């Protein structure tokens, strides 16, 4: 149908906007602490601690399969990155601190993205 196509154009445009959002969030992690999945070879107990692992490469795979229906789903995955790290790692670690800084800096990007998504529909 013509509608399914119009719908698909919106999803594609959402994907376009979320790709830019993702790039902006990932720039706030210059150390690349959140770039890839926590290695189960190097942290073999990780899944005993963290039930839903997340990282920027995993989010990008979903993004490029147009797997995010709305900004809320995307934010859920970003929040998992931060929250998993803040649980697994202690307060006095470079990892915990990196998560706090990502959360704080990402807030600004996500604030405007929500306005853009509502605004452009």
Curated annotation (Swiss-Prot):
The residue range of the signal peptide is none
Q: In which tissues is it expressed?
A: Highly expressed in testis.
The UniProt record lists the Bromo domain at 9-113
- Which residues form the Glycyl lysine isopeptide (Lys-Gly) (interchain with G-Cter in SUMO2) crosslink? 41
The subcellular location is: Nucleus; Chromosome
Could you describe the subunit structure of this protein? Answer: Component of some HBO1 complex composed of KAT7/HBO1, MEAF6, ING4 and BRD1/BRPF2. Component of the MOZ/MORF complex composed at least of ING5, KAT6A, KAT6B, MEAF6 and one of BRPF1, BRD1/BRPF2 and BRPF3. Interacts (via PHD-type zinc finger domain) with unmodified histone H3. Interacts (via PWWP domain) with dimethylated and trimethylated 'Lys-79' on histone H3.
Protein task: Scaffold subunit of various histone acetyltransferase (HAT) complexes, such as the MOZ/MORF and HBO1 complexes, that acts as a regulator of hematopoiesis. Plays a key role in HBO1 complex by directing KAT7/HBO1 specificity towards histone H3 'Lys-14' acetylation (H3K14ac), thereby promoting erythroid differentiation.
UniProt protein name: Bromodomain-containing protein 1
Q: Organism source for this protein? A: Homo sapiens
């Amino acid at each position: 149908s013509m509608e399914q196509v119009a719908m698909e154009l919106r999803l594609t445009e959402l994907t376009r906007l979320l790709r830019s959002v993702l790039d902006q969030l990932q720039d706030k992690d210059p150390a690349r602490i959140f770039a890839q999945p926590v290695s189960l070879k190097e942290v073999p107990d990780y899944l005993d601690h963290i039930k839903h692992p997340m990282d920027f490469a995993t989010m990008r795979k979903r993004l490029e399969a147009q797997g995010y229906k709305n900004l809320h789903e995307f934010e859920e995955d970003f929040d998992l990155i931060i929250d998993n790290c803040m649980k697994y790692n202690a307060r006095d670690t470079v990892f915990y601190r990196a998560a706090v800084r990502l959360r704080d800096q990402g807030g600004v990007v996500l604030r405007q993205a929500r306005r853009e998504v509502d605004s452009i529909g």
